[PDB]
Amino acid sequence: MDDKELIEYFKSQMKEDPDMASAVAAIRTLLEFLKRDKGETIQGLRANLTSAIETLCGVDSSVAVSSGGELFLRFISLASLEYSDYSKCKKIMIERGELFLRRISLSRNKIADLCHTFIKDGATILTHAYSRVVLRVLEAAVAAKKRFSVYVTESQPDLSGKKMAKALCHLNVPVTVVLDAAVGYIMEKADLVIVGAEGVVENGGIINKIGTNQMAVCAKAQNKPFYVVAESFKFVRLFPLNQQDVPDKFKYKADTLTGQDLKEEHPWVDYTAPSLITLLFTDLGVLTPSAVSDELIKLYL
Amino acid sequence: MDDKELIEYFKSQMKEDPDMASAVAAIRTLLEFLKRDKGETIQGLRANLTSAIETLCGVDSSVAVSSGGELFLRFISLASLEYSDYSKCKKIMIERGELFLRRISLSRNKIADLCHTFIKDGATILTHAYSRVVLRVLEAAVAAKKRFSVYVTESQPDLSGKKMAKALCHLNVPVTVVLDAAVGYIMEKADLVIVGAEGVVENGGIINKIGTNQMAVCAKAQNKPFYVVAESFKFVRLFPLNQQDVPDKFKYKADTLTGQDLKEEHPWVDYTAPSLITLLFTDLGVLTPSAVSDELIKLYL
Amino acid sequence: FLKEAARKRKFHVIVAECAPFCQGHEMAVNLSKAGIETTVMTDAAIFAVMSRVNKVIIGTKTILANGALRAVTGTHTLALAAKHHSTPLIVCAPMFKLSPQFPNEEDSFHKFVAPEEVLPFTEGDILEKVSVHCPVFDYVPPELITLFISNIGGNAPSYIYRLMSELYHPDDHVL
């Protein structure tokens, strides 16, 4: 299909299900592109899919979209490595893509089921920004007859923390919204920290909404546990060394892409090193950060 | 002087000189109250001054006002210890109070002269919120023909960081405003951190605008120097053990004084431990935090 | 200090050579003449051997107003290695080595001797495009120092300011 139809399909997929993740919607759109493809060669299909992936990344600059695109590319490469015939390869690609969509539609339930048992009764949970996975985990914890309090950061400038607070109030949970600057003031109250992730880098660290790195540093200072919940399709083969090593296309939004009220075009994501992360709750289970790299090393090579 | 006239005099003193610190204005108002006092005994004067200090602290909840009031109380006590006759005591009190005002009117110049030599040429300085002392230090550094870049946090919710950025732009200094959440993202760029202080506690730590504690923690994580500039009248005899040990009258503003959009009445100040502070630049010179306690141990007893 | 201690006590001393001026070698010879079990090693082995070192005792050239040190080169690395293992670091320096100058800047801290000590002149044309630097002194921040032993006793680095005020006048800091 054409680029305009691709963008329209991706946006409609996002709009129909608000709870659908951006990476999942991108993967479904890529599968639709594969179904609608007309080429009869693996190289042409790969080139077309790469064009589709870069179009989608231009539409949405989140790390999740890029990681989903790379996962789909590796999926078609693995399918091609098995069978040389292109027709049978495409048939198997379509079937396994449908199975892949069905399987990754259930990642959040598995993550919640695995993670809700880590929330001690009568505990305080500190959260940064909005995250559907964290919301599902807290829903599961509430449904298990657990009482807990929640502190949520405002998460400037989009104020997604207030949206998360509304969502948690819908579940009848005591939720208090704090300023970002107040994180270091409030860490002494929180028993544990639970945050989402826009992408899990090779070393096991995460790339998340701006302000997560300082939350992790403050938690490490006070020896509080730091838990990350993220699905497997958010795994990406990136190895940043510092905050400036993160690619610029992820820091600054799609529409966005001196010394006097410059504001340096405030970044939207930052990188948290794996040493500041206690555990990850993926649909593959509960993992240490060092496990994440394994899932990539076995995936490639 | 009655309470209403005291409040009017304090507010007028603040209004006439915008650059005048709140503690200095409070001390000048206390000296005016001493001059206008009609009592003929030390204990009555002490009680009246305590009531005046309580009124001023009700007007302004900053730690600086309370520390200035306590300093004035200790000053009148020291004057009363030497002299038994109340008339000579009051005369000497008035003269030494005038000298005290004249001396503490020059604290910022001394602080700037001492601190501007610590800013290396071609360096980056990270600052939190607005501070007249930091502004004077940067003015002195600029006047010494030094080129440097400045990052200033927004300092929600009053956005005093933008005011500080405008003030620095007046001095033709490259200044960039960052979000509070971005502090941990930007620390790798800053060569040093310079912040003011609303009060210096006994142990050498500081009580400052909310967000300073996490800045100090992030600086300690990356081994960046952390410098505080504060005058001597901001020294307080307080020993908080954690963030909740800070008195509530300082956290919440004068006009300000569950589990569902509560926000817990966001605090305005937090406590930074002395272990996160490299040096202090007071009008008494360049000090380690451990020196601060000395200045109090010799002041009393 | 070590020779006085060795009269009644038995202990093992490890001396870093402090290249390029390998004065530590001499320090190892004299300590060997006193019967002290001594070991010489290059500055590259400081971190490797620090794991088995109980105490660190060093001299200094200058003690700054905030308790920092202007010591021989490689002392900052030794202090960092000691801080990693939480090994105490003791500075045996007399009173006259205390200087009221803060380490603000002044671009006059390090003393750069001829690069002949680091890279010999007989290297050849390789020297016409290579920048060789040979600093003599290292700046040790006060956070890595545990104790100062002077003729007046033992002090913490946090008390050095007081020893400033009773030795020098603030108006005489800048001559």
Curated annotation (Swiss-Prot), chains A, B:
What does the record give under GO molecular function? Answer: guanyl-nucleotide exchange factor activity; identical protein binding; translation initiation factor activity
Q: Which residues carry this modification: N6-acetyllysine?
A: K35
- Kindly report the protein's main subcellular placement as a broad class: cytoplasm
Any Pfam family from its record, for instance, is IF-2B
Q: In Gene Ontology terms, what is a biological process of this protein?
A: cytoplasmic translational initiation
Q: Does the keyword Ligase apply?
A: no
- Tell me the SUPFAM superfamilies matching this sequence: NagB/RpiA/CoA transferase-like (SSF100950)
**Activity regulation as described:** Activated by the chemical integrated stress response (ISR) inhibitor ISRIB which stimulates guanine nucleotide exchange factor activity for both phosphorylated and unphosphorylated eIF2.
Q: Where in the cell is it found?
A: Cytoplasm, Cytosol
List the GO terms this entry assigns under cellular component, sorted alphabetically: cytoplasm; cytosol; eukaryotic translation initiation factor 2B complex; membrane; plasma membrane
Q: Does the keyword Metal-binding apply?
A: no
| Keywords tagged on the record | Acetylation, Cytoplasm, Disease variant, Initiation factor, Leukodystrophy, Protein biosynthesis
Q: What does this protein do?
A: Acts as a component of the translation initiation factor 2B (eIF2B) complex, which catalyzes the exchange of GDP for GTP on eukaryotic initiation factor 2 (eIF2) gamma subunit. Its guanine nucleotide exchange factor activity is repressed when bound to eIF2 complex phosphorylated on the alpha subunit, thereby limiting the amount of methionyl-initiator methionine tRNA available to the ribosome and consequently global translation is repressed.
Per UniProt, subunit arrangement is:
Component of the translation initiation factor 2B (eIF2B) complex which is a heterodecamer of two sets of five different subunits: alpha, beta, gamma, delta and epsilon. Subunits alpha, beta and delta comprise a regulatory subcomplex and subunits epsilon and gamma comprise a catalytic subcomplex. Within the complex, the hexameric regulatory complex resides at the center, with the two heterodimeric catalytic subcomplexes bound on opposite sides.
| Protein family | Belongs to the eIF-2B alpha/beta/delta subunits family.
UniProt disease annotation: Leukoencephalopathy with vanishing white matter 1: An autosomal recessive brain disease characterized by neurological features including progressive cerebellar ataxia, spasticity, and cognitive deficits. Brain imaging shows abnormal white matter that vanishes over time and is replaced by cerebrospinal fluid. Disease severity ranges from fatal infantile forms to adult forms without neurological deterioration. The disease is progressive with, in most individuals, additional episodes of rapid deterioration following febrile infections or minor head trauma.
The name this protein carries in UniProt is Translation initiation factor eIF2B subunit alpha
Q: Which organism is it from?
A: Homo sapiens (Human)
Swiss-Prot record, chain C:
Annotated compartments: Cytoplasm, Cytosol
* Recorded superkingdom: Eukaryota
Q: Which disorder is it associated with?
A: Leukoencephalopathy with vanishing white matter 2: An autosomal recessive brain disease characterized by neurological features including progressive cerebellar ataxia, spasticity, and cognitive deficits. Brain imaging shows abnormal white matter that vanishes over time and is replaced by cerebrospinal fluid. Disease severity ranges from fatal infantile forms to adult forms without neurological deterioration. The disease is progressive with, in most individuals, additional episodes of rapid deterioration following febrile infections or minor head trauma.
The UniProt function text for this chain reads: Acts as a component of the translation initiation factor 2B (eIF2B) complex, which catalyzes the exchange of GDP for GTP on eukaryotic initiation factor 2 (eIF2) gamma subunit. Its guanine nucleotide exchange factor activity is repressed when bound to eIF2 complex phosphorylated on the alpha subunit, thereby limiting the amount of methionyl-initiator methionine tRNA available to the ribosome and consequently global translation is repressed.
Q: Which family does it belong to?
A: Belongs to the eIF-2B alpha/beta/delta subunits family.
Spell out the subunit comment: Component of the translation initiation factor 2B (eIF2B) complex which is a heterodecamer of two sets of five different subunits: alpha, beta, gamma, delta and epsilon. Subunits alpha, beta and delta comprise a regulatory subcomplex and subunits epsilon and gamma comprise a catalytic subcomplex. Within the complex, the hexameric regulatory complex resides at the center, with the two heterodimeric catalytic subcomplexes bound on opposite sides.
Name it.
Translation initiation factor eIF2B subunit beta
- Origin species, per record, is Homo sapiens (Human)
Covered residues of the complete protein? 177 to 351 of 351
